Amino acid sequence: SRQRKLEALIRDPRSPINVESLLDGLNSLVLDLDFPALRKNKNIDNFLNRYEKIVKKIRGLQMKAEDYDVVKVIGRGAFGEVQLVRHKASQKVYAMKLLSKFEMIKRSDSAFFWEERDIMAFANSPWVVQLFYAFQDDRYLYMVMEYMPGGDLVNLMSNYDVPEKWAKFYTAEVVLALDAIHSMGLIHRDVKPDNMLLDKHGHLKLADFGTCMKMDETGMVHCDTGTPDYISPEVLKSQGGDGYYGRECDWWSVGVFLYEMLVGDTPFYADSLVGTYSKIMDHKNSLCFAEISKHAKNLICAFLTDREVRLGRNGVEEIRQHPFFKNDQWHWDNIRETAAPVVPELSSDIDSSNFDDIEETFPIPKAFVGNQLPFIGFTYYR
Amino acid sequence: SRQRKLEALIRDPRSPINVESLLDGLNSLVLDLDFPALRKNKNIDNFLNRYEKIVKKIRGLQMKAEDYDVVKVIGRGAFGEVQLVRHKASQKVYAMKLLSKFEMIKRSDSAFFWEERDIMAFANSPWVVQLFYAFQDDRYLYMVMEYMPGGDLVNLMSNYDVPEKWAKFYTAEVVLALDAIHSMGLIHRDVKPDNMLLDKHGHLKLADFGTCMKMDETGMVHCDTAVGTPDYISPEVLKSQGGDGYYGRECDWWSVGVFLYEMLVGDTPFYADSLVGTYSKIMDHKNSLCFPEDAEISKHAKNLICAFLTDREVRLGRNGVEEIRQHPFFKNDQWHWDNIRETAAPVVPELSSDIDSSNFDDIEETFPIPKAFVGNQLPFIGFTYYR
Numbered sequence: 001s002r003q004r005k006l007e008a009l010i011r012d013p014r015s016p017i018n019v020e021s022l023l024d025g026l027n028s029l030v031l032d033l034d035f036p037a038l039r040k041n042k043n044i045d046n047f048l049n050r051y052e053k054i055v056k057k058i059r060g061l062q063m064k065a066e067d068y069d070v071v072k073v074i075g076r077g078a079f080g081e082v083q084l085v086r087h088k089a090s091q092k093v094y095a096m097k098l099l100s101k102f103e104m105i106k107r108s109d110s111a112f113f114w115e116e117r118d119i120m121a122f123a124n125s126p127w128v129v130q131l132f133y134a135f136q137d138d139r140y141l142y143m144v145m146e147y148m149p150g151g152d153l154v155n156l157m158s159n160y161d162v163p164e165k166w167a168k169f170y171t172a173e174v175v176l177a178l179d180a181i182h183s184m185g186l187i188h189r190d191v192k193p194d195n196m197l198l199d200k201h202g203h204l205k206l207a208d209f210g211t212c213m214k215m216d217e218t219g220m221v222h223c224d225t226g227t228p229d230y231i232s233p234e235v236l237k238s239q240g241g242d243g244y245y246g247r248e249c250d251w252w253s254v255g256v257f258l259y260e261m262l263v264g265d266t267p268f269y270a271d272s273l274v275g276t277y278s279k280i281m282d283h284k285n286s287l288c289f290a291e292i293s294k295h296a297k298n299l300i301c302a303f304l305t306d307r308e309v310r311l312g313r314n315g316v317e318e319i320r321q322h323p324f325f326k327n328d329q330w331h332w333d334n335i336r337e338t339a340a341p342v343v344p345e346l347s348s349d350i351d352s353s354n355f356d357d358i359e360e361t362f363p364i365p366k367a368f369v370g371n372q373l374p375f376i377g378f379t380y381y382r
Numbered sequence: 383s384r385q386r387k388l389e390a391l392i393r394d395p396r397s398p399i400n401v402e403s404l405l406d407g408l409n410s411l412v413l414d415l416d417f418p419a420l421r422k423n424k425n426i427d428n429f430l431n432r433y434e435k436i437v438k439k440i441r442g443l444q445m446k447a448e449d450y451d452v453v454k455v456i457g458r459g460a461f462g463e464v465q466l467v468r469h470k471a472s473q474k475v476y477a478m479k480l481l482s483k484f485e486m487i488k489r490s491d492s493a494f495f496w497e498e499r500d501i502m503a504f505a506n507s508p509w510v511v512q513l514f515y516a517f518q519d520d521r522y523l524y525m526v527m528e529y530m531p532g533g534d535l536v537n538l539m540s541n542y543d544v545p546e547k548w549a550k551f552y553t554a555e556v557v558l559a560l561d562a563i564h565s566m567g568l569i570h571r572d573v574k575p576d577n578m579l580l581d582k583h584g585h586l587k588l589a590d591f592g593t594c595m596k597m598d599e600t601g602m603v604h605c606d607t608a609v610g611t612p613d614y615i616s617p618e619v620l621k622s623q624g625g626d627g628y629y630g631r632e633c634d635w636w637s638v639g640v641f642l643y644e645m646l647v648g649d650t651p652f653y654a655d656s657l658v659g660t661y662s663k664i665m666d667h668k669n670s671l672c673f674p675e676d677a678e679i680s681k682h683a684k685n686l687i688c689a690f691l692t693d694r695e696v697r698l699g700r701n702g703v704e705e706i707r708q709h710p711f712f713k714n715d716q717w718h719w720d721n722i723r724e725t726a727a728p729v730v731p732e733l734s735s736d737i738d739s740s741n742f743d744d745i746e747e748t749f750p751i752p753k754a755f756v757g758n759q760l761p762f763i764g765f766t767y768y769r
């Protein structure tokens with residue numbers, strides 16, 4: 001066949017050897033070889049003279065952080081900040097998440113983003129925040145995503161006293177969004193109001209995929225990797241050395257979310273990491289309520305039990321037909337194209353009134369350290 | 383102002399960042415990192431576990447040396463042999479030059495082939511031997527060229543007594559071959575009968591481009607190394623070893639002079655028992671150059687040689703290739719300069735089959751595992767070429 005089998009692999013933007021990735025493999029080789037210490041090497045100097053020229057040019061004609069106006073900083077993650085940005089040429093407003101390369105190399109935390117990228121880029125769901133451009137430089141990783149001007153549910157829940165019928169909507173849109181995540185053979189692990197963003201029209205989209213794992217042939221995962229509030233008992237227990245868990249661990253998170261939304265506090269709240277963790281483990285005795293209807297009370301309890309009997313172990317169908325999700329203005333077939341509880345009031349394309357306000361280098365190597373190598377293949381254009 | 387600018391750079395076959403070279407980039411990185419000592423590094427291991435699998439599958443599709451049957455070894459250069467090969471699938475015959483990656487690295491001389499490749503892969507001249515494929519593996523560099531069953535001119539000079547009528551032809555063809563090399567912006571520096579091969583029809587081609595330098599924007603080169611074979615070296619290239627060297631194409635016309643002298647006299651002009659003696663005779667070429675009493679040579683032939691074998695300032699061909707063409711020696715009734723290559727050759731080779739190598743005499747170690755990063759395969763990233 002020759003270069004037909006090989007041409008196909010290059011074309012696929014899902015394959016790790018697409019053109020953009022091959023270019024990363026050159027840049028990160030130049031970026032990690034270009035230090036005077038290592039330059040004493042004959043081989044490393046031959047290479048860098050022949051390529052440094054053309055490599056610098058390439059760097060020029062592909063997406064940079066300079067190609068964006070930074071309207072304002074709207075969030076701050078574990079590694080970098082999330083910015084509200086406007087691309088200069090097209091003038092289109094996006095949300096740009098920065099990830100610090102150095103703060104990732106300085107931690108057992110420099111592979112998480114691969115799932116965060118693949119989901120947001122290729123999920124193609126109405127339930128997933130959508131990635132347009134993924135690019136990098138010597139310092140940072142960048143993801144350019146559709147901006148969600150509606151805020152997150154942590155902001156809504158503090159701003160509005162949430163009544164039962166509002167929770168019927170919000171829980172349901174999480175259920176569906178989660179099912180979409182599951183149908184890509186993935187568990188979210190850490191589902192919570194922070195990863196729940198609202199769009200222009202007040203509808204849900206999941207966002208923070210950092211802690212995602214891909215299910216086994218069976219459907220479980222068997223490896224250890226935050227803060228407990230919304231985390232399932234089996235997941236905490238399994239941090240001490242293996243033991244599988246599955247998709248049902250996300251449904252636990254949902255119950256915690258429905259509780260917090262209806263009551264006001266998380267069901268296992270305590271003013272310490274230890275306290276919430278301890279309460280979760282003894283969930284049999286710790287969960288108690290009030291002013292909640294029996295149908296809503298019941299769904300919370302069907303979620304907040306160990307994985308064996310937890311609602312949604314048998315399927316997403318159990319959840320749907322539950323008496324709590326019975327209303328008038330939406331069916332599961334059209335929930336997204338109905339009116340949301342809170343449709344956000346938006347002045348312009350850069351309005352961020354649903355978000356609040358907020359106000360590093362690599363060490364020059366002696367030997368080859370390969371700091372950029374973990375980030376080869378991250379670059380992506382729509 | 384678009385990434386369609388970039389799109390062009392990738393597609394351009396003679397661009398440093400074509401897809402083959404980008405894939406070489408990924409490959410020679412996997413090769414220079416996959417060692418247990420190196421893999422103690424988190425980064426290098428994070429990388430290899432994600433790429434090593436797919437990289438292996440690619441290597442599978444890449445042109446192996448297994449793709450060829452080796453008919454006979456027909457030559458051996460400094461850094462490896464030249465095998466007469468038949469490509470298995472196509473069943474076509476090729477000459478394949480091997481270049482040892484180890485011996486090339488071990489001797490600090492590992493940049494000479496880049497020109498050698500471009501000349502053969504892109505010359506498109508009937509005077510330049512032509513490259514079809516250029517692949518590599520961890521151990522070797524490979525050059526698949528069109529086979530030249532006729533043999534080299536060193537062979538022709540020791541099987542036949544060359545009369546001046548033949549010398550006229552061969553010298554003329556060498557002259558035109560070099561003009562084609564020059565018109566591509568390159569000086570050869572190593573013109574010799576060994577680098578002069580003969581096609582199926584007994585006609586010339588130039589072969590060993592390892593020593594080639596590309597002229598600057600003014601047709602001159604700055605070289606401070608005395609490069610090439612000691613017998614054919616020009617006084618300027620020789621002197622250039624010490625201090626600022628400065629020369630153009632003229633040095634190639636020196637070689638042509640020596641070539642002709644060898645062909646008519648039967649010996650090189652500045653021959654000596656040592657290398658160090660040959661150099662000295664070249665330096666004192668006014669006094670050392672003389673034709674023997676017994677060798678009979680036309681007054682035209684001696685004129686052409688001596689016009690070639692002088693200081694660059696007064697050397698023939700300094701004022702264009704034209705003053706060579708019209709030289710009285712090149713007067714004949716058998717070929718013009720327009721056609722020469724389509725006249726009958728003085729020696730047409732008798733080939734019995736497509737693997738006949740009767741015009742070639744028959745004949746008849748790797749890297750250590752590194753501690754840290756060494757990048758042994760880095761000088762070879764981008765070698766790979768296909769037609």
Ligand SMILES: Cc1[nH]ncc1-c1cc2c(s1)C(=O)N[C@]1(CC[C@](O)(c3ccc(F)cc3)CC1)N2
Pocket residue numbers: 074075076077078082095097129145146147148149154194195197207208209
């Ligand atoms: C706004 C937008 N529009 N289109 C995409 C986005 C994203 C926003 C974030 C995204 S995308 C993300 O990936 N991470 C975070 C990092 C900050 C976070 O941890 C936070 C903030 C405040 C809290 F009170 C608690 C938590 C939430 C997740 N933010």
Ligand SMILES: Cc1[nH]ncc1-c1cc2c(s1)C(=O)N[C@]1(CC[C@](O)(c3ccc(F)cc3)CC1)N2
Pocket residue numbers: 456457458459460464477479511527528529530531534536576577579589590591
């Ligand atoms: C035959 C063919 N067909 N298509 C390409 C070729 C090439 C052949 C060679 C090529 S291409 C080459 O690059 N190098 C050499 C290595 C051996 C050499 O140095 C030599 C020196 C003195 C000798 F008495 C004999 C041989 C000559 C050049 N051979």
